[PDB]
């Protein structure tokens, strides 16, 4: 006899985005209407402290700064495929045999 001792499978090491420490660098939000939007922008307004100075040196002035930032784009995709025979056996059982 050849005596097959055992049939060994594989169990994958599951990983999820929130499980990884890299998520600490991230801030994950779901947005169900996301594909519709074109671009997301944010606005910044900053005014600077100024230092009073003595006569002899020209005085400092007020300033105002506005900064705009923009969103990126990076879709991803994955295919998976099945042969029609598996669909047929999933749907149809015939002759009832074991």
């Amino acid at each position: 006899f050849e005596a097959i001792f055992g049939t060994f499978c594989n169990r994958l090491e599951w990983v999820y985005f929130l499980t990884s420490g890299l998520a600490a660098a991230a801030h994950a939000i779901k947005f169900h209407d996301l594909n519709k939007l074109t671009t997301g922008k944010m606005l910044f307004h900053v005014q600077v402290p100024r230092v009073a100075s003595g006569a002899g040196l020209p005085t400092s002035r007020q300033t105002t700064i506005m900064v705009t930032k923009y969103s990126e784009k990076s879709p991803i995709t994955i295919p998976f495929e099945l042969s029609a025979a598996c669909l047929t056996y999933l749907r149809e059982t015939f002759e009832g045999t074991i």
Binding site: A24, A25, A26, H27, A28, I29, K30, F31, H32, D33, L34, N35, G40
Partner: peptide, 12 residues
């Protein structure tokens, strides 16, 4: 990277 350097928004 620092905490929440960039925020990712995803759909289902």
């Amino acid at each position: 990277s620092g905490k929440s350097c960039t925020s990712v928004i995803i759909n289902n």
